[PDB]
Amino acid sequence: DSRIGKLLGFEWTDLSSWRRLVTLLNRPTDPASLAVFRFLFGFLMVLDIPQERGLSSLDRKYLDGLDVCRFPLLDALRPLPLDWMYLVYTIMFLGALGMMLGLCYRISCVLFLLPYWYVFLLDKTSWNNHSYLYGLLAFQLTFMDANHYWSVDGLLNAHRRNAHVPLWNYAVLRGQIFIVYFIAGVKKLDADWVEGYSMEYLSRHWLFSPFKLLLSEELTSLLVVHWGGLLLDLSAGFLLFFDVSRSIGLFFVSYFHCMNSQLFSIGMFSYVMLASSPLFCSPEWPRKLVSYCPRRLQQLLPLKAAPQPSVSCVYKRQKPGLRHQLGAAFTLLYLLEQLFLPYSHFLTQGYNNWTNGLYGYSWDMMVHSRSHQHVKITYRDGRTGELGYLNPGVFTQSRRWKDHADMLKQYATCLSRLLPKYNVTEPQIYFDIWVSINDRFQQRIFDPRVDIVQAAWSPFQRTSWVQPLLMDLSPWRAKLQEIKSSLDNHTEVVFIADFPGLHLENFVSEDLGNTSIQLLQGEVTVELVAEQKNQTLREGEKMQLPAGEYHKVYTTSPSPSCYMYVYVNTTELALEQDLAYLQELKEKTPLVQTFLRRQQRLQEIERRRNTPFHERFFRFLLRKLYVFRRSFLMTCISLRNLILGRPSLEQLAQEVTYANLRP
Amino acid sequence: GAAFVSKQEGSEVVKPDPLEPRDELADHIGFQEAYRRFYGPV
Numbered sequence: 001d002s003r004i005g006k007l008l009g010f011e012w013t014d015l016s017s018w019r020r021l022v023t024l025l026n027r028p029t030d031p032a033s034l035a036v037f038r039f040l041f042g043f044l045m046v047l048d049i050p051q052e053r054g055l056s057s058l059d060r061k062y063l064d065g066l067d068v069c070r071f072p073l074l075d076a077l078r079p080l081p082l083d084w085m086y087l088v089y090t091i092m093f094l095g096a097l098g099m100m101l102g103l104c105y106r107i108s109c110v111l112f113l114l115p116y117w118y119v120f121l122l123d124k125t126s127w128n129n130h131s132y133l134y135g136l137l138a139f140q141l142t143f144m145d146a147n148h149y150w151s152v153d154g155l156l157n158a159h160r161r162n163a164h165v166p167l168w169n170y171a172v173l174r175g176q177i178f179i180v181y182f183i184a185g186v187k188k189l190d191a192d193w194v195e196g197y198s199m200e201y202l203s204r205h206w207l208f209s210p211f212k213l214l215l216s217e218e219l220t221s222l223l224v225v226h227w228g229g230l231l232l233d234l235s236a237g238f239l240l241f242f243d244v245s246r247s248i249g250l251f252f253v254s255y256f257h258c259m260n261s262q263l264f265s266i267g268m269f270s271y272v273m274l275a276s277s278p279l280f281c282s283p284e285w286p287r288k289l290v291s292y293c294p295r296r297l298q299q300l301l302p303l304k305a306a307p308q309p310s311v312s313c314v315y316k317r318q319k320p321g322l323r324h325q326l327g328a329a330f331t332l333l334y335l336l337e338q339l340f341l342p343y344s345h346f347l348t349q350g351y352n353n354w355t356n357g358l359y360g361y362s363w364d365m366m367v368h369s370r371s372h373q374h375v376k377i378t379y380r381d382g383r384t385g386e387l388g389y390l391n392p393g394v395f396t397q398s399r400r401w402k403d404h405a406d407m408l409k410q411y412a413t414c415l416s417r418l419l420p421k422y423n424v425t426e427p428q429i430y431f432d433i434w435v436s437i438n439d440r441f442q443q444r445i446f447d448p449r450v451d452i453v454q455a456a457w458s459p460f461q462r463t464s465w466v467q468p469l470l471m472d473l474s475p476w477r478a479k480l481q482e483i484k485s486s487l488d489n490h491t492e493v494v495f496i497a498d499f500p501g502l503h504l505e506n507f508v509s510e511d512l513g514n515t516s517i518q519l520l521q522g523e524v525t526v527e528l529v530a531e532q533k534n535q536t537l538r539e540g541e542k543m544q545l546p547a548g549e550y551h552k553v554y555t556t557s558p559s560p561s562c563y564m565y566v567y568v569n570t571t572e573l574a575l576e577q578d579l580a581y582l583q584e585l586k587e588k589t590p591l592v593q594t595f596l597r598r599q600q601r602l603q604e605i606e607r608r609r610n611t612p613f614h615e616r617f618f619r620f621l622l623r624k625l626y627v628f629r630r631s632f633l634m635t636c637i638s639l640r641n642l643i644l645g646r647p648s649l650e651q652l653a654q655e656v657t658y659a660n661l662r663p
Numbered sequence: 664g665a666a667f668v669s670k671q672e673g674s675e676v677v678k679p680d681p682l683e684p685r686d687e688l689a690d691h692i693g694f695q696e697a698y699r700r701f702y703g704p705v
């Protein structure tokens with residue numbers, strides 16, 4: 001009855017006390033919009049388990065007898081045997097199936113919640129902003145009365161059938177999707193986003209084609225991608241909330257998630273956030289579409305009647321019991337820590353690198369994109385001193401450890417116990433990783449002189465061996481693209497910034513004839529190791545380097561120096577001086593199949609254009625059919641291995657080739 | 664073994680990754696024998 005009561009759904013007299021806030025948050029609401037989200041979340045988690053949770057690739061990931069460096073969050077979390085990890089994933093599948101149907105919904109929520117967060121914390125490199133969100137939406141829904149409408153719990157239990165839910169089941173769910181949107185909009189106020197650097201390639205997609213009619217493509221990436229994703233994420237939960245702007249807001253966030261379903265392969269994120277945006281609507285909206293259909297159809301649909309009263313709400317005439325005070329407490333406390341954990345990065349400073357905090361829980365999607373130039377992992381034997389070199393990615397199943405100091409300390413520790421199986425007694429492992437974030441200068445992210453096995457990492461101390469991101473060389477990025485545009489189709493360039501006192505030992509391969517180093521800023525001293533000859537360069541001086549030999553670039557400036565490697569691959573150039581000599585004589589013997597393996601690939605990448613959409617889609621459902629069939633058949637192999645036992649290997653072999661069959 | 668590299672390939676500097684989107688997983692060090700150890704001759 002006031003102006004604010006029609007606008008926010010409550011007046012300030014409902015916030016006058018704790019009892020009036022418990023009464024407001026446990027106000028009886030229609031169960032219908034909460035229980036269509038329960039289906040659409042529990043159905044998109046049934047699909048997510050063989051695809052993105054890794055049930056279909058569980059035999060390749062959690063295989064027994066495999067030397068592997070794992071990255072759990074808590075290091076005491078060890079994965080089970082592969083036979084039991086197929087039971088964790090079929091408990092999580094029955095949990096997402098009983099959350100979808102609403103069958104034993106309190107039991108089926110903790111059958112999905114508990115093995116999801118076991119699997120989620122068992123790999124820090126599988127953390128996304130959506131796989132974190134699906135474990136948040138399944139955490140809230142454990143406590144919500146989502147089986148109060150359109151469930152088989154309504155059919156079995158008669159007092160759960162079409163009964164009222166409290167208001168806090170929506171104020172948490174709307175408050176979560178507002179926090180997902182709005183905090184992502186102030187993570188995108190970074191200088192890499194408002195200047196048009198993160199997702200600079202994204203406007204070259206074909207889905208940004210109508211914006212090219214009015215703007216340039218230089219300005220389509222700046223306005224539509226960067227400022228259009230800022231001013232949508234900043235104001236999505238403001239548009240969806242209020243009644244005057246919801247239909248404008250529902251259209252802008254339906255388009256924003258139908259674009260991101262094709263621009264990126266992020267799992268079910270674009271369909272979970274599409275199924276969540278109708279929680280901001282009026283909670284009666286499934287009943288308002290049930291009534292619009294023909295008359296005998298609604299006996300397969302849920303009931304269109306008014307909801308019966310429930311014990312879970314606070315009604316007007318009732319003193320609120322202990323359950324109703326645990327819903328006004330779960331709403332305020334959890335939406336406080338959902339506003340805090342994207343900014344809790346001053347607390348967990350051991351997880352802090354060039355970007356703040358560990359990835360997954362901060363809603364900074366696409367804000368920071370990396371490109372690695374060089375990883376050099378150098379062990380050193382404990383009883384000999386043999387300075388040897390490891391492969392860059394030996395026992396890891398991921399490449400996220402080279403960005404994060406917590407994972408590099410996990411990789412260096414795991415390599416300290418795995419290398420004695422390869423006659424390295426106690427290694428001293430040094431990581432030399434060159435990352436450039438958002439088209440910047442390539443620099444070392446970690447110090448290459450620190451022994452990471454004995455280096456000190458703790459979760460709440462800022463790490464000593466992480467090099468600072470040189471943000472005073474971020475003005476240079478307009479000049480670096482000017483140099484990249486100045487080059488022809490043949491020469492490539494690697495821009496590199498190095499710290500004082502450090503050097504870069506590069507081995508120019510013999511394929512790279514005519515390579516050279518031009519100093520842009522600072523003062524380096526290029527050593528040629530084969531001749532043992534130095535040459536000090538200053539700003540603007542070029543210097544040619546030999547192919548097939550070693551050279552070292554010693555930084556001798558008191559400030560960080562910057563240079564570039566303008567190289568050309570004269571081996572593949574002389575290969576295309578012969579293959580582009582060979583094709584013109586074709587329309588008139590090691591090299592002839594290398595021409596033919598490129599005329600081979602010219603056949604099938606062109607019929608990527610010449611295939612129809614309906615058979616593209618038919619092949620994509622075949623792929624999906626095979627990823628849902630292998631995940632079902634390799635589960636039954638490992639579910640027989642626990643009940644009936646494990647048979648002979650020749651009979652295990654017959655089933656796995658049967659499971660790996662294309663359908 | 665295959666867990667090591669020489670000092671000509673580990674020292675080659677020349678030779679966009681957003682962390683949000685969701686493959687190799689079988690190019691491991693001792694994969695094909697530890698697969699046939701737990702499974703059959705697949």
Ligand SMILES: *[C@@H]1O[C@H](CO)[C@@H](O[C@@H]2O[C@H](CO)[C@@H](O)[C@H](O)[C@H]2NC(C)=O)[C@H](O)[C@H]1NC(C)=O
Pocket residue numbers: 501502503525527532533534554555556
């Ligand atoms: C070329 O110059 C570099 C830069 O000073 C020399 O590198 C130094 O080498 C000594 C002995 O190996 C080390 O103690 C120094 O720490 C190195 N300097 C830096 C900055 O690390 C290199 O020896 C010179 N080479 C020749 C042949 O003169």
Ligand SMILES: CC(C)CCC[C@@H](C)[C@H]1CC[C@H]2[C@@H]3CC=C4C[C@@H](O)CC[C@]4(C)[C@H]3CC[C@]12C
Pocket residue numbers: 113114115117118135136139341
């Ligand atoms: C060990 C096996 C049984 C799995 C047990 C699951 C436990 C560890 C899971 C289940 C529910 C999870 C919580 C769900 C929601 C959140 C909010 C999030 O922003 C921080 C983590 C936090 C607080 C989780 C902590 C870990 C948690 C308690």
Ligand SMILES: *[C@@H]1O[C@H](CO)[C@@H](O)[C@H](O)[C@H]1NC(C)=O
Pocket residue numbers: 491514568
């Ligand atoms: C090496 O490449 C650069 C790139 O422009 C070119 O200017 C130079 O002439 C080349 N030198 C030789 C010897 O090919």
Ligand SMILES: *[C@@H]1O[C@H](CO)[C@@H](O)[C@H](O)[C@H]1NC(C)=O
Pocket residue numbers: 509511512569571572575677678
């Ligand atoms: C140069 O091109 C050849 C292809 O002929 C390739 O094998 C080689 O790796 C390239 N050089 C570098 C340094 O990548």
